[PDB]
């Protein structure tokens, strides 16, 4: 009727707001669920949904958002996460007493189910409000940068935040992706280039490569310790791009350091490390193969002009030792070797 559903509704509203005050114990579940049930049974489900949305929205806008706004400059993360927790706990019960509408009504009207609606309200009204958003991004990124600079940070907080974003994605990484992962990847890239220049400047090729591997491992550990697992693949892609891929020729051609120097002095371990590293990115093995090809060709051709077969058989032996131990008997390396030989034997 006109006034029946309203008389039920004021009760339901009082109950919901009550649940949001954490005094929920003392509320009769059977009564609330029954009332919601009958209200839906009377085809008033739309009103129930709307009222739900408005009560929840009012709670998150007028209190929670203000709660995390006054907390900006002390325990910001703890406050936000506490708010997230309280919100979840409340929306559990709110879902439970609205369960009948949730299972049946929401489907045919194509509207978000109770809990996911709650997630949407919390996302838009709090985390995405834009003071909270910017300060959150800056907080996490700053903490990560600091941890990269050797300082100790609280990884629990970061983990909780990233998780929260993942949840707010509604069975998706989207909000976690755009609010956190992307600027994280940008920043990380910048920092990585910054370190790469330093290492390339003051080191040899071998220690540089070892440092790239170690870099990868630290970043992976950071992914599993703090961030979401899904961010493992993107960040390593960045590490490999900045440290290895942009610098490939610089790395292989280092004077008294890189590929030709490792061939001359027969460093097998270093060639193994270089091969293993450069097998990660496209054109790496091709880079090694090209530099090597040039070397072997100039040397062999220099040999062809002014016994003979023992020198050649020893060279063949040497490069077969390389190919076997270092280069993992790779087809590309074999083909480029035989190519060099077939070139300068003529």
């Amino acid at each position: 009727d006109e006034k029946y559903v309203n008389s039920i509704w004021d009760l339901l509203k009082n109950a919901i707001q009550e649940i949001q005050r954490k005094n929920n114990s003392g509320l009769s579940f059977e009564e609330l669920y029954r009332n919601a049930y009958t209200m839906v049974l009377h085809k008033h489900g739309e009103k129930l949904y709307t009222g739900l949305r408005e009560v929840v929205t009012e709670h998150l806008i007028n209190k929670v958002r203000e709660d995390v706004l006054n907390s900006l400059n002390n325990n910001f993360l703890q406050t936000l996460n506490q708010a997230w927790n309280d919100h979840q706990t409340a929306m559990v019960m709110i879902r439970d007493i609205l369960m009948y509408m949730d299972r049946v009504y929401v489907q045919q009207n194509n509207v978000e189910n109770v809990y996911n609606l709650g997630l949407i309200i919390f996302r838009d009204q709090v985390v995405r409000y834009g003071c909270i958003r910017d300060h959150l991004r800056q907080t996490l990124l700053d903490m990560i940068a600091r941890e990269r600079k050797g300082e100790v940070v609280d990884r629990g907080a970061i983990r909780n935040a990233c998780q929260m974003l993942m949840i707010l994605g509604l069975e998706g990484r989207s909000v976690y992706e755009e609010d956190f992962e992307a600027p994280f990847l940008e920043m990380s890239a910048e920092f990585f280039q910054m370190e790469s220049q330093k290492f390339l400047a003051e080191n040899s090729a071998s220690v540089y490569i070892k440092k790239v591997e170690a870099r990868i491992n630290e970043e992976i550990e950071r992914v599993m310790h703090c961030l979401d697992k899904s961010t493992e693949e993107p960040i390593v892609k960045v590490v490999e791009r900045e440290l290895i891929s942009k610098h490939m020729r610089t790395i292989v051609e280092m004077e008294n350091s890189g590929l030709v120097h490792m061939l001359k002095n027969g460093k097998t371990e270093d060639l193994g490390c270089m091969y293993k590293l450069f097998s990660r990115v496209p054109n790496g093995l091709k880079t090694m193969c090209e530099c090597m090809s040039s070397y072997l060709r100039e040397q062999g051709k220099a040999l062809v002009s002014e016994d003979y077969r023992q020198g050649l058989d020893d060279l063949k032996s040497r490069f077969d030792r390389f190919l076997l131990e270092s280069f993992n008997n790779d087809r590309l390396f074999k083909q480029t070797i035989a190519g060099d030989f077939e070139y300068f034997l003529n």
Binding site: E30, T38, L41, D96
Partner: protein, 192 residues
């Protein structure tokens, strides 16, 4: 394995062993195990595992369900199967939907659709509409073909209540052999 586990759970209930809650409807008092009810239903699960007063209550009462029906449904929860006929079906579907046992709701729905007759209609389209079984609404209205009664079109309008005064001609699909239906009805509808 689980079948026999339930089979003995039943015995333990009837021997009133390890029963942590009594649920009462009107006449009947049913002892049961909280975890079995919580396992077979989301309603009971949210009730017993909830932070709301019911969970701290050793005894408890649910209404808008008659006693015999409640007994039948707890018996369903334990035995996994149920009996459904035309007498009980319409007190069965809303009561099961309340306690959130959906397989039973589906049972009653299938049973309703199965018996559809030119006269049947009626509650089947109304029930669904009120009980939000949509497949049944679709099935019932797709079942409306050239009925042409004065009498059981009487059935059509009579139990569809007031909102149908809207949806009767709000539906543009209606094409009638005798066009009288708009007038003779209303005064009679106004007579009653």
């Amino acid at each position: 394995h689980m079948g026999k586990a339930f089979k003995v759970m039943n015995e333990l209930r009837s021997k009133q062993l390890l029963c942590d809650v009594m649920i009462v409807a009107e006449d009947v008092e049913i002892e049961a195990h909280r975890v079995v009810l919580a396992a077979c239903s989301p309603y009971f699960c949210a009730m017993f595992t909830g932070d709301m007063s019911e969970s701290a209550a050793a005894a408890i009462e649910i209404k808008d369900v008659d006693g015999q029906t409640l007994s039948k449904l707890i018996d369903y929860i334990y035995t996994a199967e149920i009996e459904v006929t035309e007498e009980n079906v319409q007190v069965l579907l809303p009561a099961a939907s309340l306690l959130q046992l959906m397989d039973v709701r589906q049972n009653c729905c299938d049973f309703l659709q199965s018996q559809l007759h030119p006269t049947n209609c009626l509650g089947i389209r109304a029930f669904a509409d009120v009980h939000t079984c949509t497949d049944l609404l679709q099935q019932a209205n797709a079942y409306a073909e050239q009925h042409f009664p004065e009498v059981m079109l009487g059935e059509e309008f009579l139990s569809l209540s007031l909102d149908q005064v809207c949806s009767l001609i709000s539906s543009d699909k209606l094409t009638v052999s005798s066009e009288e239906k708009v007038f003779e009805a209303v005064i009679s509808w106004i007579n009653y």
